[PDB]
From Swiss-Prot:
It comes from Gallus gallus (Chicken). Its EC number is 3.2.1.17. It comes from the Eukaryota. This is Lysozyme C. The lineage of its organism: Eukaryota, Metazoa, Chordata, Craniata, Vertebrata. Lysozyme C is capable of both hydrolysis and transglycosylation; it also shows a slight esterase activity. It acts rapidly on both peptide-substituted and unsubstituted peptidoglycan, and slowly on chitin oligosaccharides.
């Protein structure tokens, strides 16, 4: 499913992401925009052979099992395919563990490079939240 900007903001808020670990909602919507372009079905393979899955591009080397990443740790205990669902619950629950990992949202390279220190409030501007 391809989310609309405000539609995603509302689902993420309902799922407890607004200000989770200090990160306002705009940060999460900005990250999804640049990670997957709001598409739950997005996948991207990396050079190390792992693959990124879903709306938040969660990596198969540490967080989910895709059955083809040798040495995967599956920290969120879910098959990576669960992360491509139109229901974002699995992606959100796993993202909460990732952001609590000690590096915060820097775990997402697109957030670090394109959202960090920008006016992220613009991403939820105009939305009925």
């Amino acid at each position: 499913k391809v989310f609309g900007r405000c539609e995603l903001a509302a689902a993420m808020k309902r799922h407890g992401l607004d200000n989770y670990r200090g990160y306002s909602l705009g940060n999460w919507v900005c990250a999804a925009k640049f990670e997957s372009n709001f598409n739950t079905q997005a996948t991207n393979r990396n050079t190390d052979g792992s693959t990124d899955y879903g709306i938040l591009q969660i990596n198969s080397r540490w967080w989910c099992n895709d059955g083809r990443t040798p040495g995967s740790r599956n920290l969120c205990n879910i098959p990576c395919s669960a992360l491509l669902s139109s229901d974002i619950t699995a992606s959100v629950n796993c993202a909460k563990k990732i952001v609590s990992d000690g590096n915060g949202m820097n775990a997402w390279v697109a957030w670090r490079n394109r959202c960090k220190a920008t006016d992220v409030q613009a991403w939820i501007r105009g939305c009925r939240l």
